[PDB]
Amino acid sequence: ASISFTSINLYATFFPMAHNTASTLEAMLRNDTNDQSFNDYLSAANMLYP
Amino acid sequence: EINLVQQSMPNRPNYIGFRDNFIGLMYYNSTGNMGVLAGQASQLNAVVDL
Amino acid sequence: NFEVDPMDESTLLYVVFEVFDVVRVHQPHRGVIEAVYLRTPFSAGNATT
C-alpha cells in the first residue's frame, strides 16, 4: 500500500453579514474581557505504563 | 608462453575505519528514531529532535 | 497499584488523569492572536517551538 498527495487546498466559508454589524462585533471582541476560552473534551494527561 | 608476460600492480589502498567522533552511529535529527530523556513517571520527552 | 489478568502478549496500561486543559485566546489587534494555556495538576513542562 502506498499513498501520494497531489494538491492540498484550504477551504473556508464566511458568513455574509452587514459590514456595520460585522465591525461592531470585531470591536467588541478586541476587548480583553471578551476573550474566547475553550477546553478539551477529554482534558487529561495521557500516560502509558508497560 | 603468452602468460609469461603479464604486469601486476597492487590494489588501491582503502583504509576503512569509523567516522570522526562516531558520526552516524547514533540517530540525531531524525523524527522516527528520536532518543528520549524522560522523567520518573512524567511521560514527557525532554529531547525534541527536528 | 493495579492488578490485572495475565496475558501472553505485551500489554500497556493507559491511565488518564483528568485535568482542566484550558486555552484563553485573545486577539487584541488586527493580525495578532495570542493564547495562554493553563493545565492544572499536570502542568505543561513543554512550551516547545
Side-chain angles (χ1 to χ4, degrees):
Chain A
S2 300
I3 197 164
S4 52
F5 295 150
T6 306
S7 303
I8 308 185
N9 301 143
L10 173 67
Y11 280 83
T13 311
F14 294 80
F15 177 50
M17 59 188 301
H19 279 26
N20 183 32
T21 312
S23 51
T24 304
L25 180 56
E26 291 161 8
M28 291 187 298
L29 293 168
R30 287 194 195 287
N31 291 355
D32 63 350
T33 53
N34 291 354
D35 295 350
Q36 305 179 71
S37 186
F38 308 98
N39 58 277
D40 206 12
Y41 178 87
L42 176 72
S43 291
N46 297 119
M47 310 297 199
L48 296 168
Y49 297 107
Chain B
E1 189 176 64
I2 303 302
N3 286 15
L4 296 173
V5 184
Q6 294 182 102
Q7 305 305 118
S8 181
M9 272 67 175
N11 300 346
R12 304 291 77 99
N14 181 235
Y15 296 84
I16 296 175
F18 286 117
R19 293 189 179 276
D20 300 2
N21 297 93
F22 301 123
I23 311 300
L25 180 53
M26 296 178 63
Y27 285 96
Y28 296 110
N29 310 120
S30 185
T31 326
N33 294 114
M34 171 175 71
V36 181
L37 179 63
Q40 187 164 306
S42 300
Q43 304 300 275
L44 297 172
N45 58 349
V47 170
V48 175
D49 285 356
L50 302 174
Chain C
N1 181 23
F2 283 75
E3 184 175 57
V4 292
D5 295 359
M7 296 182 66
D8 295 352
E9 294 185 56
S10 299
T11 36
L12 301 173
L13 181 64
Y14 175 21
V15 184
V16 177
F17 287 85
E18 184 93 354
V19 301
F20 283 79
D21 175 24
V22 180
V23 61
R24 171 170 165 147
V25 179
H26 182 200
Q27 295 159 95
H29 175 47
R30 181 183 173 185
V32 176
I33 184 165
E34 301 180 359
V36 167
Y37 289 79
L38 182 60
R39 281 172 53 96
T40 38
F42 290 93
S43 298
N46 299 127
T48 308
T49 305

